[PDB]
Every structure is written in structure tokens, then in C-alpha cells.
Scaffold this active site. Structure first.
Site, PDB file in Angstrom:
ATOM      1  N   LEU A 105      10.192  -3.208  -6.529  1.00  0.00           N
ATOM      2  CA  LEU A 105      10.696  -3.234  -5.153  1.00  0.00           C
ATOM      3  C   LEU A 105      10.045  -4.340  -4.314  1.00  0.00           C
ATOM      4  CD1 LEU A 105      12.781  -1.985  -3.234  1.00  0.00           C
ATOM      5  CD2 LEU A 105      11.055  -0.286  -2.596  1.00  0.00           C
ATOM      6  N   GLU A 129      20.114   5.887  -3.950  1.00  0.00           N
ATOM      7  CA  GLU A 129      20.152   6.960  -4.946  1.00  0.00           C
ATOM      8  C   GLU A 129      19.077   8.009  -4.708  1.00  0.00           C
ATOM      9  OE1 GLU A 129      22.797   7.229  -6.505  1.00  0.00           O
ATOM     10  OE2 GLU A 129      23.449   5.327  -7.378  1.00  0.00           O
ATOM     11  N   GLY A 148      29.925  -4.923  -4.558  1.00  0.00           N
ATOM     12  CA  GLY A 148      28.543  -4.463  -4.720  1.00  0.00           C
ATOM     13  C   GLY A 148      28.286  -3.313  -5.674  1.00  0.00           C
ATOM     14  N   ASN A 149      29.310  -2.889  -6.418  1.00  0.00           N
ATOM     15  CA  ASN A 149      29.166  -1.800  -7.389  1.00  0.00           C
ATOM     16  C   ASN A 149      28.257  -2.193  -8.553  1.00  0.00           C
ATOM     17  OD1 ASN A 149      30.814  -0.179  -5.830  1.00  0.00           O
ATOM     18  ND2 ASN A 149      32.651  -0.512  -7.074  1.00  0.00           N
ATOM     19  N   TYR A 150      27.667  -1.187  -9.209  1.00  0.00           N
ATOM     20  CA  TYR A 150      26.752  -1.418 -10.341  1.00  0.00           C
ATOM     21  C   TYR A 150      27.374  -2.281 -11.437  1.00  0.00           C
ATOM     22  CZ  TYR A 150      23.428   2.163  -8.625  1.00  0.00           C
ATOM     23  OH  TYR A 150      22.545   2.914  -7.899  1.00  0.00           O
ATOM     24  N   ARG A 175      20.358  10.219  -1.974  1.00  0.00           N
ATOM     25  CA  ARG A 175      21.390  11.118  -2.494  1.00  0.00           C
ATOM     26  C   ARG A 175      20.839  12.268  -3.339  1.00  0.00           C
ATOM     27  NH1 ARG A 175      24.309   5.728  -4.273  1.00  0.00           N
ATOM     28  NH2 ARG A 175      25.548   5.301  -2.394  1.00  0.00           N
ATOM     29  N   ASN A 221       1.472   3.988 -10.155  1.00  0.00           N
ATOM     30  CA  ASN A 221       1.751   2.544 -10.139  1.00  0.00           C
ATOM     31  C   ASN A 221       2.240   2.020 -11.494  1.00  0.00           C
ATOM     32  OD1 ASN A 221       2.080   0.152  -8.653  1.00  0.00           O
ATOM     33  ND2 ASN A 221       0.035  -0.599  -9.205  1.00  0.00           N
ATOM     34  N   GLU A 257       8.873  -7.121  -5.491  1.00  0.00           N
ATOM     35  CA  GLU A 257       9.465  -8.345  -6.032  1.00  0.00           C
ATOM     36  C   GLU A 257      10.904  -8.531  -5.568  1.00  0.00           C
ATOM     37  OE1 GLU A 257       8.719  -7.525 -10.160  1.00  0.00           O
ATOM     38  OE2 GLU A 257       6.558  -7.656  -9.798  1.00  0.00           O
ATOM     39  N   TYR A 268      25.973   3.681   0.980  1.00  0.00           N
ATOM     40  CA  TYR A 268      26.196   2.436   0.245  1.00  0.00           C
ATOM     41  C   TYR A 268      25.518   1.252   0.934  1.00  0.00           C
ATOM     42  CZ  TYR A 268      29.116  -0.475  -2.851  1.00  0.00           C
ATOM     43  OH  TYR A 268      29.571  -1.353  -3.797  1.00  0.00           O
ATOM     44  N   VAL A 269      24.819   0.423   0.154  1.00  0.00           N
ATOM     45  CA  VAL A 269      24.247  -0.819   0.681  1.00  0.00           C
ATOM     46  C   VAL A 269      25.378  -1.845   0.772  1.00  0.00           C
ATOM     47  CG1 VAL A 269      22.536  -2.650   0.384  1.00  0.00           C
ATOM     48  CG2 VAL A 269      21.984  -0.315  -0.326  1.00  0.00           C
ATOM     49  N   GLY A 299       0.795  -1.232   0.000  1.00  0.00           N
ATOM     50  CA  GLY A 299       0.000   0.000   0.000  1.00  0.00           C
ATOM     51  C   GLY A 299       0.826   1.281   0.000  1.00  0.00           C
TER      52      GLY A 299
END
Length: 259
Positions: free
Chosen positions: A140, A173, A117-119, A176, A191, A142, A76-77, A11
Site C-alpha cells: 500500500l 473490499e 476500472g474492473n479487476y 465490504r 508486517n 508503494e 467503487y474506486v 507507522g
């Protein structure tokens, strides 16, 4: 003792997402460092370990939860927890490797991925670039499920990588860049899922350079212009901090502020 911020895709609305990103920013920055109206994240140097991380607990409509760990110095994650297992990206250095031992200390199973973990690395593993990975509340939702089921073998590595790419952009991001937050708010409002356009991608890629240019500027004026892209892919030249005030919400610490 690390602060926890909760968000659910269940929701989710523009307002609930806005509240979430605002809360993340509030836990990432103190009021200590603001330059040309833009907050700077804590300096890594001399930062006590008890202040190093924040936790983002993501829930979804499927009644599943994962907890992302974010480094306050760069948003950073660095890893995640799902139930009895925690997973961390391959650390850049010995200092970071020690730092992550302070996260999810009561978890039964600790893993460090052999990959960073970089792109670049995540896109390689996903088999898709950011420009082809859809973002929005659906992705998200999923992604949270995919992260949750990894330990039991339900999630393939490409799907895991894709799911990280989703989380990073919609959380880190967005924290940021107000611009990127705005792009996510729009996806939520209607949506409608969609891959990030060149304006999003070029901002993500330029965060370090933009942070340095602002912090090293002469009264806000860049020594060298930075090239970004508009939504249609056309070039936009940045010469000054002024134009970035509505765009960038947080900077990584790059240098000391001049007197």
C-alpha cells in the site's frame, strides 16, 4: 463538500487501520437500510449528487498523498487525485460520466482513462492476477507512491494497474467484508505481505451475488446455494444469511426489502 477520510501507511497499526475502515463504512452507509443485521449501501436511484461520493486521502512514509474517490452506492474506486492532476476510470454510462464531473473540480488537469476500472481490465494491464499481487502495508505504501508519480511518467501502466488493485482490495473490499478487513489487519500486525488466498478472491467475486441472494432470500434462506472457497481452496456452501453476518459488512442495493 464530500466527506474526507484520512489514512496513512506511515507507522500503520492494526488499530489505525481498524479506525480507518470503520470510518469509511460510516461515511458509505446511513442507518436507513439494514437487512438481516447487514447494512445496505444507498440506492443509486434518486440519490442526490451532493451525497454520491466520499474521498479517501492516503498518505505514506514517503510524505506523498493521493486522494481516492469512492462511489457510495458500491464503494467503487472511480478515480484519484495526485497534486495537479486527476484521473478517472472509463464510466459505465452517461449518468456516471456526469457524476464524476462533480469530483476534484479545482484540479488543473482532468483525465478519463480509456479503460474501465474492473479487476479483469486492471489485471490485464498489470500483467498479473489478484492471486499473484501481494497485499499489506508495504504494498500500500508503494501503491501510494506509484499513483502519485504517474502524471510525471515515473510509473509504468502495469505498475499503476497493480497499484489500483492493491488500493481497491485494502480499502473497498475491506469496507465490504469484515473477513477481508481481518485478513489485512493480520498482514499489518506482523508486517508480512502476501497475495490474497482463494477465500478472499471468491468473496470479492461473489459480493453482488451474495448481496442479491441475501436481499431476495425467504426469511434469510437462499433459494440457490452460493459456493465460496476456504483458505485452502476447498468449497464452502452458503445456504443462509446467518453464516455471512460475521463475514459481510456492507451490501450493494439489489432490491427493495419485503414487508
Amino acid at each position: 463538500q464530500y466527506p474526507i477520510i484520512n489514512f496513512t501507511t506511515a507507522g500503520a497499526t492494526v488499530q489505525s487501520y481498524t479506525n480507518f475502515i470503520r470510518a469509511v463504512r460510516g461515511r458509505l452507509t446511513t442507518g436507513a437500510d439494514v437487512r438481516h443485521e447487514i447494512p445496505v449501501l444507498p440506492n443509486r436511484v434518486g440519490l442526490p449528487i451532493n451525497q454520491r461520493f466520499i474521498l479517501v486521502e492516503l498518505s505514506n512514509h514517503a510524505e506523498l498523498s493521493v486522494t481516492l474517490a469512492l462511489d457510495v452506492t458500491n464503494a467503487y474506486v472511480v478515480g484519484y487525485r495526485a497534486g495537479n492532476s486527476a484521473y478517472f476510470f472509463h464510466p459505465d454510462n452517461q449518468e456516471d460520466a456526469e457524476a464524476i464531473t462533480h469530483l476534484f473540480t479545482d484540479v488543473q488537469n482532468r483525465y478519463t482513462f480509456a479503460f474501465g476500472g474492473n479487476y479483469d481490465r486492471l489485471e490485464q494491464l498489470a500483467g498479473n492476477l489478484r492471486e499473484n499481487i501481494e497485499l499489506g502495508n508495504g504494498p500500500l505504501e508503494e501503491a501510494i507512491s506509484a499513483l502519485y508519480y504517474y502524471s510525471t511518467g515515473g510509473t509504468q501502466l502495469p505498475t499503476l494497474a497493480r497499484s489500483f488493485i492493491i488500493c481497491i482490495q485494502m480499502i473497498s473490499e475491506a469496507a465490504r467484508f469484515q473477513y477481508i478487513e481481518g485478513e489485512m489487519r493480520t498482514r499489518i500486525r506482523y508486517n508480512r505481505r502476501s497475495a490474497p488466498d482463494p477465500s478472499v478472491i471468491t468473496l470479492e467475486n461473489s459480493w453482488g451475488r451474495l448481496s442479491t441472494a441475501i436481499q431476495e432470500s425467504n426469511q434469510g434462506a437462499f433459494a440457490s446455494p452460493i459456493q465460496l472457497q476456504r483458505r485452502n481452496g476447498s468449497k464452502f456452501s452458503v445456504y443462509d444469511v446467518s453464516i455471512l453476518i460475521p463475514i459481510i459488512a456492507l451490501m450493494v442495493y439489489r432490491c427493495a426489502p419485503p414487508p
